[PDB]
Symmetry: D2
């Protein structure tokens, strides 16, 4: 099942969509700077693109640490991004009250992994009728995603994306199970599946070589999109050039059975 | 480091405290009946006892399964439990705004595992000055607990309990790392460590609960955290007799 | 199922048996010294005792790998003469089995080798009591598969030895629920706990906590290593505490 | 580092090599039949191929499962496979004393995962001077493979292949860490790394094997290893991906 997000077709047999931007909104200008860069690279490579940012940092290094620009200011910034660039955007929500107002502005709203089992937040997101991205918890098996899908469905919203992030592997480590993508497709009605390679990397080319190998491996399984929380060199375009080459090949192969 | 909860001394070298009760407050009369049974059995054996329930169950099986009685009625039930039985009570909080009204009533407030890294909530909990139970997420290593403890300390609250609930072991399964209790003690200032046997799990379930509880308590812990209907309620006395035996043995010998 | 090993009764509802000794045999004199200590401590504590050592470290690097086989057996012969106790050692090759078995009362299947069907059969054939080291990669519900091979090869005197489970990379965890699973699915054969190898990744403190936790689940035995590994001088104090707990658990009816 | 196996070049920047065949050797006629199938499909696609079988499999699922035709007849069968098809062959050994006579015939000799730490076998295998396939145990971290490599090096043989088989993931399940390949390359001197997709496992089974193989090969590997129409369609897909990947240079650093 494909999902239309404006002029973008997101699905598991469509050209991959890049979800990318920044961790936590800080200022208007450094936001537009970052998004202009993604847009420029994705445009020239021909890759559909959705800008990502949070307005709030939920887990902070200190009780005193910077927290982000918050909802009201956050939403202002998003509104600007859409105006300037004419692209979709995606952000996470943490509170049911937040859902409708965020959804007025943000094309896709995201269920944080830690909140994935919070029924209140599920219901309130569903009710917006917006496209929803479900961050698969590291502690949840691919087989359980169907249970989250069922709740959203029951709550009246079937416009759901499933987003791989890795799985708990002993203490403080993650592993990505490449078979999980297929399990999710098969059990969740072939909803779009996307791969958050960045957050999968708990833990040649160093880290850049790692991200590349892992991103290539996941996209080889035929996925709707790739989700980056970040990555004189042009590191982004080098990366994407290779992802696009593999994705174009994969998506040109007929599906078996 | 010990914590006083009314007339109870909670600590890793003290007689174990039972944190026991039910999942979700759904009723008054039934809650009181269940509590009565825990009270009678624990009093009979001289085990210190804190009644546990949630008024607002976060992760429901379905979108419309009953979430519980809610904050206002829930606190009223806790008030009745405290008045009737003279025991402390423990409940979880999900939002900063809930912290004050819950803490005014409840002796221990609980940080759910899924919110354990939600700074806003941590700070709001700290600031109540209440005794706090920190539920360890299944995906967090024991060495990471110190980071939560630090955040509480920064925010002015040192009355903290760490609660073990197992660790993710491949898909779906949980394992309890018996070594983790010690790592928590050694890195978190020998704060009270308690073991949630019920949520660490998943004569079948009963025989597993007993083996697992005994194994945990053999490591020298402050308390044991369980839920009944979940242990069958009528077998509570037998279960506790066995836990007490082991706890009394272990605690009676000095640390080696 | 209980298993008689000379005058020792080994079983999950019997007083725990200590399987103790050292990583590897290096000399006669050091072996007899370490054994002497184990025997005197266990005798006064009233704990049944089986001496453990390997004659070969088959997975090291390459010079000690130990005094090797021919010499090893010599030393085991001495140990048995002097102290009148049973002994246990591991075999890594099928041909080793029968000659090792003439001397050593319990023979051990190494964890890495549990799927080696020629070794299983050769071990089984000896008719000796067998200690099966549970592989780090094998679930407790699959121990039954190794048991079945031994049964089908005509030996039912099997001990199941927990040694921890793979947990991510380079770490182990001991699943305290595993003991019960093994009991229920493997016909209540003696289950023992290798606390030493489980600890692979203070030590004195973590070993005691881990050993107490396992024995709390009602086991036939404890399997451990010292060096002059628990510090040897601590063995008596360590064992006092293990016995204390074992005695309590074993006094409590099942169910 | 590349390894030459007769006319084949095996290496992480070379077209992938297929390792495949039968579980255990039964008979000459049986072996030739199966081998011819692999040969026809691989030749038709231009994929280098090495025939795999055991002559004495020591880790089968029952005690009385057939272990194969044995050393003497096995080696006679391997000789005939080599002569008939002009391809290399690979077989496992589990006893030190087997190594020399096996190495007379078999181009590649394979260290079973369960013996990977067994020094005596490692030394006896090394001393053959043959190409060696090291099966990575499911309990061994990818950064530990360097220790095995070192033991082979000490014993005088560096013609080593590393074979991924997956990693213990809780109980029973195996997961393949796609990052482990890179770790092995980095720490083991860019020795050829191959992927045993079949073991790694336990649409259907087929759809899975496809996804998992494609994922591994996307990381740039010397070969694909298969345990116990269809083979053609699979290999077409692997080759497409492999050709694409291998034809691009490594990241600019
Ligand atoms: Cl760039
Ligand atoms: Mn040892
Ligand atoms: Na209070
Ligand atoms: Na593992």
């Amino acid at each position: 099942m494909d999902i239309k997000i404006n002029d973008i077709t997101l699905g598991n047999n469509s050209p991959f969509v890049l979800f990318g931007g920044i961790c936590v909104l800080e200022s208007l200008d450094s936001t537009l700077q970052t998004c202009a860069h993604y847009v420029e690279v994705t445009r020239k490579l021909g890759i559909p693109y959705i800008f990502k940012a949070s307005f709030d940092k939920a887990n902070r290094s200190s009780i005193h640490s910077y927290r982000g620009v918050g909802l009201e200011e956050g939403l202002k910034i998003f509104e600007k991004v859409k105006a300037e660039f004419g692209i979709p955007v995606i952000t996470d929500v943490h509170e049911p009250h937040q859902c409708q107002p965020v959804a007025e502005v943000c094309d896709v709203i995201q269920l944080p992994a830690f909140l994935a089992r919070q029924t209140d937040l599920v219901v309130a997101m569903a009710k917006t009728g917006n496209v929803v991205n479900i961050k698969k918890p590291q502690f949840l098996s691919p087989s359980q995603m169907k249970n989250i899908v069922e709740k959203f469905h029951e709550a009246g919203n079937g416009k759901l994306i499933l987003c791989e992030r890795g799985s708990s592997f002993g203490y403080d480590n993650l592993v990505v199970d490449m078979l999980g993508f297929g399990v999710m497709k098969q059990t969740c009605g072939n909803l779009p599946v996307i791969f958050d390679v960045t957050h999968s990397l708990q833990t040649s080319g160093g880290r850049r070589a790692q991200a590349l190998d892992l991103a290539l491996a996941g996209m080889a399984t035929r996925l709707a999109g790739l989700f980056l929380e970040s990555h004189p060199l042009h590191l982004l375009e080098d990366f994407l050039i290779r992802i696009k080459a593999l994705d174009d090949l994969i998506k040109s192969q007929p599906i078996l059975t």
